[PDB]
Amino acid sequence: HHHHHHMVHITLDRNTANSWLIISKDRRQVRMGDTHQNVSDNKERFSNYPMVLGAQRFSSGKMYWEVDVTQKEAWDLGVCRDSVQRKGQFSLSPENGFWTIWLWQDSYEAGTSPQTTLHIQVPPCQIGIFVDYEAGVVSFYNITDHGSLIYTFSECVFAGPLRPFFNVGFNYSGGNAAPLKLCPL
């Protein structure tokens, strides 16, 4: 792909983070803590899952960023509406305002309803995410495998401003402590 020149500098929004997340000083890395991180509750925080949003809001144009997923067993990545549900249980679907892919139990799936099997020969260590607001497109790229396409959501009905979306996943296994990291331009 040739989307690299739409690169945007994403930072994480602490106020949206689940209360167990640890976000680095530079707001470019996030991991699951082993306990509550001693923050006050608020209506923005994701309560049920280890999720956080980027601070940036997008309503036009073409945007591209990259995320490092090295050694993680489970995660979700993509974009979502600014007005997605924060509290309680919900599924990641375009009906609920999410355009995402994930790793879970050694398989990769796109967050359609119902979910779609992805075909990845080279497990990615870094994922590229491309949004074309006007075109209604969200695409995912395997940076480890020379930028090969993973998945394209097309005919997207964003219906609002978009924010970068992250889930570091639970760490019940003791094998999923590694962070998500926003990779440098």
Ligand X SMILES: O=C(Nc1ccccc1)Nc1cccnc1
Per-residue contact string for residues 28-57; x = within reach of ligand X by CB under 6 A: ---x--------------------------
Maximum Cα–Cα distance for the chain, whole Å? 43
By CB under 6 A, the residues from 3 to 32 that bind ligand X are: 31
Residue 71 CB, nearest distance to ligand X (Å)? 5
Q: Can you tell me the distance from the alpha carbon of 52 to that of 84, in angstroms, rounded to the nearest whole number?
A: 12
* Residue 179, both tokens: 């962070």
Q: Cα–Cα distances in Å, from 184 out to 59, 62, 64, 142?
A: 23, 18, 12, 16
Q: Of the listed pieces 41-49, 74-82, 140-148, 174-182, which binds ligand X according to CB under 6 A?
A: 174-182
- Considering the complex, what minimum distance in angstroms separates the CB of residue 22 from ligand X? 9
Per the DSSP assignment, residues forming a β-bridge with 63 are 131
User: Count of CB atoms within 10 A of residue 50's CB?
Assistant: 25
**Nearer to ligand X (CB atom), residue 10 or residue 178:** 178
Nearest approach in angstroms of CB 123 to ligand X is: 14
Q: Which is nearer to ligand X, 39 or 183 (CB)?
A: 183
Give, as ranges, the residues between 101 and 160 that touch ligand X (CB under 6 A). none
Q: Which is nearer to ligand X, 72 or 81 (CB)?
A: 72
Nearer to ligand X, 51 or 180 (CB): 180
CA dist 15 and 80 (Å) reads: 16
Residue 178 near ligand X by CB under 6 A: yes
Both tokens of residue 99? 């355009």
Contact 31, 179 (CB under 8 A): yes
Q: To the nearest 10°, report the CA torsion of 106, 80, 46, 39.
A: 110
Q: Which of 71, 91, 152, 154 binds ligand X (CB under 6 A)?
A: 71
Which of residues 177 and 183 has its CB atom nearest to ligand X in the complex? Answer: 177
- Contact positions toward ligand X, by CB under 6 A? 31, 70-71, 177-179
